[PDB]
Amino acid sequence: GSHMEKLAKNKVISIDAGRKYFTLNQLKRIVDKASELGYSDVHLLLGNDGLRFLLDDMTITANGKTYASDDVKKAIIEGTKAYYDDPNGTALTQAEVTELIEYAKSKDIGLIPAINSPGHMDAMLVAMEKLGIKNPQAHFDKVSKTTMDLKNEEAMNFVKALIGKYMDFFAGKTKIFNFGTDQYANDATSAQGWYYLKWYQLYGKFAEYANTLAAMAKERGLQPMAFNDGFYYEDKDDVQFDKDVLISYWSKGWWGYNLASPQYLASKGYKFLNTNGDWYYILGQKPEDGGGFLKKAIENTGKTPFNQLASTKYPEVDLPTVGSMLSIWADRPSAEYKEEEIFELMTAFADHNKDYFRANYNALREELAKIPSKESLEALDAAKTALNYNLNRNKQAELDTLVANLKAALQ
């Protein structure tokens, strides 16, 4: 019950770089601002509708045949462009994402990648078509454009191998890997995908796929993360799920979309990354549209407590969370990304929870990088011993004089 508990928790900013393209430098500045504000990780969706990340070797081995690296790359580029041909760019390179991870590591910032499936995979579906894999899309009220058919082995096998190749990359580089599994065939079932899975006795098939993805993460030394949607839908435990999955809990849903309660998932032994929907911001969203516009997300950043999970009340309901995630989405990826908006929402969330967030260590690290008579060395050694790396956002002044004493000793 000491000091450490609050600071040990995760403070995450989520960027939807799957739907919309973000430049390496844009993400670097988000990472820098995250480090400055006191965040711990940057959650970066790279596969979300579009697939905006290419490895150097994209060779895939599936269905007793292989798909050549250059053939895979072109098909993915075409898929992402088919979803949305972003004039700012198509997909991040291996070298760019690698530099982002090392840059973030230098600022005590984790990177949490997300490659979504079996929903939110418009780019992958079309890529598979271009790769010869016929009809990968789910089929209900109409043929889906976002979701994979669970009965199609050819598509399932490829996608598993594809996510596996990404998982091979992020292994040893990042602690967590998010595979999503949210909003199954929402476009093809009027946002009732889990009800449709139940109906056609395919919900067990989804579990098998999700559990496979969790094992794939674990055996590669990655903590599996997924969204809550498809985990124990409607509090039924007829179909079981992997318990080692870090659940990013965003909502309990709405009418006809009966997601499991946080209370039920906690009773199954799950830990939560509090990804409360209240803190959502969709780029370009205005107050007139309702939902997650900027003013509401800033307003709710103080309204909705740090530990409070969606559909629950804190502290009346107090469930185990590893930390909280604030999310920026790009539902309409053509909307202008304005850095100032995200920075304001990020700042607000940190300012209301100064006990959870770190202090600003950018000044300290610059002054420690300037370090190359024994009496003058006595002072330089003394200021170094007096440094405190454990400060939170409430004590910026406390840290400001400690770094000032280091600057004075160095001269």
Ligand X SMILES: CC(=O)N[C@@H]1[C@@H](O)[C@H](O[C@@H]2O[C@H](CO)[C@@H](O)[C@H](O[C@H]3O[C@H](CO)[C@@H](O)[C@H](O)[C@@H]3O[C@@H]3O[C@H](CO)[C@@H](O)[C@H](O)[C@H]3NC(C)=O)[C@@H]2O)[C@@H](CO)O[C@H]1O
Q: How far apart are CA 119 and CA 229, in angstroms?
A: 11
- How many residues form the binding site for ligand X (CB under 6 A)? 15
Q: For ligand X, which stretch binds (CB under 6 A), given 25-33, 65-73, 196-204, 249-257?
A: 249-257
Residues 6 or more apart whose CB falls under 8 angstroms from that of 59 comprise: 66, 67, 68, 69, 72
Planar angle of CA 29, 30, 32, nearest 5 degrees:
60
CA–CA gap between residue 278 and residue 293 (Å, rounded): 10
Span of 70-78, 166-174, 180-188, 401-409 interacting with ligand X by CB under 6 A? 180-188
Nearest 5°: phi and psi at 297? -65, -35
The one among 166, 280, 306, 349 contacting ligand X by CB under 6 A: 280
Alpha carbons within 13 angstroms on the beta-carbon side of residue 302 total 7
Considering only residues 37, 101, 282, 342, which one is a binding residue for ligand X as defined by CB under 6 A? 282
Pick between residue 16 and residue 154 the one whose CB is nearest to ligand X. 16
3-state class (DSSP) for residue 355? coil
- What x/- string results for residues 326 through 355 when contact with ligand X is judged by CB under 6 A? ---x-x------------------------
- CB nearer to ligand X: give 38 or 47: 47
Cβ contacts of 237-244, under 8 Å, gap ≥ 24: 237/268, 239/203, 239/204, 239/207, 240/207, 241/207, 241/210, 241/211, 241/268, 242/210, 242/211, 242/214, 242/215, 243/268, 243/269, 243/270, 244/214, 244/218
Q: How far is the CB of 303 from ligand X (least distance, A)?
A: 15
Q: Give the nearest distance from C-beta 75 to ligand X in angstroms.
A: 23
Q: In whole angstroms, how close is the CB of 330 to ligand X at the nearest point?
A: 7
Tokens 């844009």 appear where? Answer: 26
For 312, the token pair is: 């629950």
Which lies closer to ligand X via its Cβ, residue 182 or residue 367?
A: 182
Question: Which one of residues 41, 122, 182, 242 is an interface residue with ligand X (CB under 6 A)?
Answer: 182
Does 276 engage in binding with ligand X (CB under 6 A)? no
Per CB under 6 A, the list member of 166, 227, 232, 361 interacting with ligand X is 227
* C-beta closer to ligand X: residue 298 or 359: 298
> Could you say which of 117, 183, 321, 353 contacts ligand X (CB under 6 A)?
183
> Using CB under 6 A, which residues numbered 8 to 47 contact ligand X?
none
CB 335, min distance to ligand X, A:
12
- Report, in Å, the least distance between residue 182 CB and ligand X: 4
* CA gap 389, 161 in Å, rounded: 41
Residue 163 beta carbon to ligand X: minimum distance, rounded to whole angstroms: 18
For residue 227, the surrounding DSSP H or E stretch is strand 223-227
Span of 162-170, 179-187, 295-303, 356-364 interacting with ligand X by CB under 6 A: 179-187
Amino acid at 310: A
Strands 65-67, 176-180: pairing kind: unpaired
Nearest CA among 43, 38, 35 for reference residue 13: 43
String marking each residue 293-332 x if it binds ligand X according to CB under 6 A? ------------------------------------x-x-
Q: How far is the CB of 291 from ligand X (least distance, A)?
A: 6
Q: How many alpha carbons lie under 13 Å from residue 356 in its C-beta half-sphere?
A: 21
Q: Which positions lie near ligand X, rule CB under 6 A?
A: 182-183, 186, 191, 227, 250, 254-255, 277, 280, 282, 291-292, 329, 331
